[PDB]
């Protein structure tokens, strides 16, 4: 019995460990969010299938690493779901062919937010998985340890919903004018979704965001967001109603808004946070 990765790294008879570099495409799913499918990344075979049956489990202690170590979730092992980190060994999967077959492991994360996320830098550790191999031949009991690394920068969703983008830049027409903000949200299953803006405001109503351009700033203007003409101030929850699998636009538009005093030439910039909640 031995195993190898998609890039050819191998662990031989008797076990050992290897590093696995994977391209991530996290996605929200109903009740659990996909972190990484490894059934395309790790493969194993039985070396004497006419004579020996090999048994393979995911051993307890397998867990997320890096920034993901705080999170709990599930592991999908040959189609069935088990808690993750594994606190007890999974059932046994038979290996009975010389042909390399996938080790059918997919890691999921339990939602803890509405539409939150957590950044994964390329090259960081996301999981350590312990493959345990036994047989019906002798008392071999071998450990194949897979250190899973992110091969790319991604954001793993931590909520029931996901956004069209995490960083959006828009450019206003030269003053005066407005521009739509392209920003949508969907949820794996229907959720009662809201959101609220956060940022530095120049007015009492907390509805105009300060011009924080640092090079040659204009004066007397800020930025103000509208939802089809309704002013959206900071720290006020806006309801989106029920959001499901069809993307919903937040409906937002950026405007210049007077803040007081002579409006002078220069640059305008405002950074505005969006945070989703359940209602």
């Amino acid at each position: 019995f031995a195993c190898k990765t998609a890039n050819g790294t191998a662990i031989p008879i008797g076990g050992g460990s290897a590093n696995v570099y994977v391209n991530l495409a996290p996605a929200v799913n109903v009740g659990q969010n996909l972190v990484v499918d490894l059934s395309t990344q790790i493969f194993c075979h039985n070396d004497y299938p006419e004579t020996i049956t090999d048994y393979v489990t995911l051993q307890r202690g397998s867990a997320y690493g890096g920034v993901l170590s705080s999170f709990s979730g599930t592991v999908k092992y040959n189609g069935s779901s088990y808690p993750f980190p594994t606190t007890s060994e999974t059932p046994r999967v038979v290996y009975n062919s010389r042909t390399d077959k996938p080790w059918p492991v997919a890691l999921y994360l339990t939602p803890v937010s509405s539409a939150g996320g957590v950044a994964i830098k390329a090259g960081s550790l996301i999981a350590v998985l312990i493959l345990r191999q036994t047989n019906n031949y002798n008392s071999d009991d071998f450990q194949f340890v897979w250190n899973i690394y992110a091969n790319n920068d991604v954001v793993v969703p931590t909520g029931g919903c996901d956004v069209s983008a995490r960083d959006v830049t828009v450019t206003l027409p030269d003053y005066p004018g407005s521009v739509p903000i392209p920003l949508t949200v969907y949820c794996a299953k229907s959720q009662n979704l809201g959101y609220y803006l956060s940022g530095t405001t120049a007015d009492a109503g907390n509805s105009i965001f300060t011009n924080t351009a640092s090079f040659s700033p204009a004066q007397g203007v800020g930025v103000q967001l509208t939802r089809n003409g309704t002013i959206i101030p900071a720290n006020n929850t806006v309801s989106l109603g029920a959001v499901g699998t069809s993307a919903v636009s937040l409906g937002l538009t950026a405007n210049y808004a007077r803040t007081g005093g002579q409006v002078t030439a220069g640059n305008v910039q405002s950074i505005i946070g969006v945070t989703f909640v359940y209602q």
Binding site: R166, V168, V170
Partner: peptide, 14 residues
Amino acid sequence: ADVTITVNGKVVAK
């Protein structure tokens, strides 16, 4: 914040 919006604009002399 779950999302960060950056709004850029300009006031031109006229």
